[PDB]
Amino acid sequence: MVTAFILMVTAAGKEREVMEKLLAMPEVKEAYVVYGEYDLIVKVETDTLKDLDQFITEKIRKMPEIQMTSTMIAI
Amino acid sequence: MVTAFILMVTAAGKEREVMEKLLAMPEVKEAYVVYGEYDLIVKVETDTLKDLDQFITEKIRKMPEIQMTSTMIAI
Amino acid sequence: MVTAFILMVTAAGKEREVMEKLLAMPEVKEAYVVYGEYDLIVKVETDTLKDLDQFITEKIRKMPEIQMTSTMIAI
Amino acid sequence: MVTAFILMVTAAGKEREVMEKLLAMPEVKEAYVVYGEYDLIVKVETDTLKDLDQFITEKIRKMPEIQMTSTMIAI
Amino acid sequence: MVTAFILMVTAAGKEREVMEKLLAMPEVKEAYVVYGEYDLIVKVETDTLKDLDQFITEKIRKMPEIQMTSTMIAI
Amino acid sequence: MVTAFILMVTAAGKEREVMEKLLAMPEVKEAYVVYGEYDLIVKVETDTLKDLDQFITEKIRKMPEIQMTSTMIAI
Amino acid sequence: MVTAFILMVTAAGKEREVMEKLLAMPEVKEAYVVYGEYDLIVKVETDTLKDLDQFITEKIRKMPEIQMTSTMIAI
Amino acid sequence: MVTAFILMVTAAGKEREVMEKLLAMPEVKEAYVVYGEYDLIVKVETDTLKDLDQFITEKIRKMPEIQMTSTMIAI
Numbered sequence: 001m002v003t004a005f006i007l008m009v010t011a012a013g014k015e016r017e018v019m020e021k022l023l024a025m026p027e028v029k030e031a032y033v034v035y036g037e038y039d040l041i042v043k044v045e046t047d048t049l050k051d052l053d054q055f056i057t058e059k060i061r062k063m064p065e066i067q068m069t070s071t072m073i074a075i
Numbered sequence: 076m077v078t079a080f081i082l083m084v085t086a087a088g089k090e091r092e093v094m095e096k097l098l099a100m101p102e103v104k105e106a107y108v109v110y111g112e113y114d115l116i117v118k119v120e121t122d123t124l125k126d127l128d129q130f131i132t133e134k135i136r137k138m139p140e141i142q143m144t145s146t147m148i149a150i
Numbered sequence: 151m152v153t154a155f156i157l158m159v160t161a162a163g164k165e166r167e168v169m170e171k172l173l174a175m176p177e178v179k180e181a182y183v184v185y186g187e188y189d190l191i192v193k194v195e196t197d198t199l200k201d202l203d204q205f206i207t208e209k210i211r212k213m214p215e216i217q218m219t220s221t222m223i224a225i
Numbered sequence: 226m227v228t229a230f231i232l233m234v235t236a237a238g239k240e241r242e243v244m245e246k247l248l249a250m251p252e253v254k255e256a257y258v259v260y261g262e263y264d265l266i267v268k269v270e271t272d273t274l275k276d277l278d279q280f281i282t283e284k285i286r287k288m289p290e291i292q293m294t295s296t297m298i299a300i
Numbered sequence: 301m302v303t304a305f306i307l308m309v310t311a312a313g314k315e316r317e318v319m320e321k322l323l324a325m326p327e328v329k330e331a332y333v334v335y336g337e338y339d340l341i342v343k344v345e346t347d348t349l350k351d352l353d354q355f356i357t358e359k360i361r362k363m364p365e366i367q368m369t370s371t372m373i374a375i
Numbered sequence: 376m377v378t379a380f381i382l383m384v385t386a387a388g389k390e391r392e393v394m395e396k397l398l399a400m401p402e403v404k405e406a407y408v409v410y411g412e413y414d415l416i417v418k419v420e421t422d423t424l425k426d427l428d429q430f431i432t433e434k435i436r437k438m439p440e441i442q443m444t445s446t447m448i449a450i
Numbered sequence: 451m452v453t454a455f456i457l458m459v460t461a462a463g464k465e466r467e468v469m470e471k472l473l474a475m476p477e478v479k480e481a482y483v484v485y486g487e488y489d490l491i492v493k494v495e496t497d498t499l500k501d502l503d504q505f506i507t508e509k510i511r512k513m514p515e516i517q518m519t520s521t522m523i524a525i
Numbered sequence: 526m527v528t529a530f531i532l533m534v535t536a537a538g539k540e541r542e543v544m545e546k547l548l549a550m551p552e553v554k555e556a557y558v559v560y561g562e563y564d565l566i567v568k569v570e571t572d573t574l575k576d577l578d579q580f581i582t583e584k585i586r587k588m589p590e591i592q593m594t595s596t597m598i599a600i
């Protein structure tokens with residue numbers, strides 16, 4: 001199994017709507033709007049790294065409101 | 076009382092327009108146009124953290140001219 | 151209640167031992183060793199902001215093994 | 226007169242003692258320990274740019290506890 | 301021969317579209333979608349530096365889907 | 376007198392047109408499109424720091440094609 | 451299989467000697483000294499994520515000449 | 526001809542002495558001590574890219590007083 005945290009910067013004022021969309025996805029276990037350089041922190045759990053790759057490319061990167069991400073995979 | 080410093084990037088030709096909105100807000104204690112990656116730095120104070128949350132999420136991040144923000148809460 | 155995520159950098163080879171010490175703290179709700187710029191991601195919760203201030207400055211940052219912390223307070 | 230905000234990263238656990246030292250300097254108008262990538266924010270005011278550079282050089286950079294800094298001159 | 305690595309950020313939902321354009325170009329030796337701040341990394345080779353200049357300025361930076369690039373020329 | 380170098384990131388494919396506009400300004404002495412994290416490097420010379428401040432706010436920041444800048448003042 | 455690009459900053463003047471050491475490692479597929487903020491780019495391939503972390507930990511991070519690194523896992 | 530701008534970080538208090546040594550090199554066309562993240566900005570010109578490669582790696586980065594360099598090649 002894979003557990004990872006994705007830190008994201010979103011367009012100003014869209015963090016809440018983006019968070020709600022992410023929370024509705026099965027891969028997403030937790031999501032919070034936060035203070036600092038990043039706007040959202042999202043915890044995801046997938047069966048494989050390939051699945052995590054697909055979550056990033058097929059879900060995250062197709063959302064225009066998300067601008068910059070940093071992913072940290074638990075080990 | 077909660078004190079925080081907010082770094083902001085505004086749309087081109089709008090940093091003065093944003094400063095004018097900021098300098099009319101009760102929560103804004105000081106505001107400066109600065110050199111660098113960010114256009115402005117603003118020191119704000121609210122009674123509680125819940126109030127800061129509302130202020131930043133609603134009055135700052137939804138301001139049309141704002142493109143990005145990074146808030147540093149102080150101790 | 152205040153929720154925050156602490157991104158940490160520990161001295162080399164101390165990640166695991168630091169994590170076990172953190173997991174013993176009542177404020178720590180989740181802790182993970184991760185691959186990336188940061189060595190650990192820790193979810194903490196306190197009753198007030200003043201308590202978090204105390205926990206981060208007097209407990210967490212005083213741990214000999216911890217070199218850097220970047221705390222993201224949740225809205 | 227030159228006004229500038231200096232963001233600094235300190236050795237973990239030394240931010241308060243550093244802030245107190247800084248607060249004792251005449252050029253320092255305000256100083257706060259903050260959450261985020263940076264640990265301290267300081268507002269300084271000097272008569273000239275020359276004096277600002279001398280300040281960070283003779284005082285700031287000569288403080289072992291201070292590890293990294295970013296200066297933002299106010300306009 | 302000049303070799304360079306180009307880090308690129310593309311518009312949302314366009315990273316595959318860009319990869320398809322890149323993988324049809326003679327100058328592209330390898331191309332990968334990557335995690336992080338950048339969406340793709342591409343290794344290119346040209347006969348001369350003047351050719352690289354033309355290639356990057358005209359075929360890469362004018363590509364409609366490209367939002368930002370950072371090119372690292374190799375020795 | 377003040378001499379400074381301004382490093383800038385521009386929208387992809389607009390670096391040349393931005394450079395031409397800057398070169399036409401009396402304050403600008405040299406300008407080059409460059410490889411790396413920055414897209415343009417511009418050398419400016421003004422009578423006072425106040426004039427440099429005005430160049431940044433009234434000229435640079437009103438140009439939508441310019442996205443992020445870093446200014447280094449000679450001393 | 452996991453493929454990743456590692457960008458590194460080395461002590462000034464030690465980049466080539468470091469590159470040669472890296473090139474002697476089986477996990478390293480290619481390596482180049484480059485212009486820019488980073489001094490070296492290395493492409494590595496390991497069977498697992500676990501092995502990638504062990505690689506940078508046992509080899510990369512244990513090289514005194516290497517001062518800073520940024521890893522980008524390829525999808 | 527190849528033109529490049531080298532952004533440098535020197536050991537503390539060595540900026541001026543490093544600058545005078547650089548000004549003596551035929552490749553160096555302009556050199557300035559500056560306020561900011563970098564200590565010096567140096568404009569250099571060589572007849573070919575291969576010569577610049579040699580100049581930066583075998584001359585510049587071998588200078589004991591220089592700690593970091595980020596070279597931006599001009600188009």
Ligand SMILES: CC[C@H](C)[C@H](N)C(=O)O
Pocket residue numbers: 015033034035036037038039040081131132144145146147225
């Ligand atoms: C609510 C905080 C927002 C999202 C941003 N991260 C900031 O610090 O300003």
Ligand SMILES: CC[C@H](C)[C@H](N)C(=O)O
Pocket residue numbers: 150206207219220221222240258259260261262263264
């Ligand atoms: C109290 C905050 C400390 C100093 C650090 N900046 C952090 O966010 O963890």
Ligand SMILES: CC[C@H](C)[C@H](N)C(=O)O
Pocket residue numbers: 306356357369370371372390408409410411412413414415600
């Ligand atoms: C010509 C280079 C462009 C402007 C950008 N700086 C890059 O490195 O890709």
Ligand SMILES: CC[C@H](C)[C@H](N)C(=O)O
Pocket residue numbers: 375465483484485486487488489581582594595596597
């Ligand atoms: C040859 C390039 C060196 C290593 C450094 N990255 C620079 O740009 O100055």
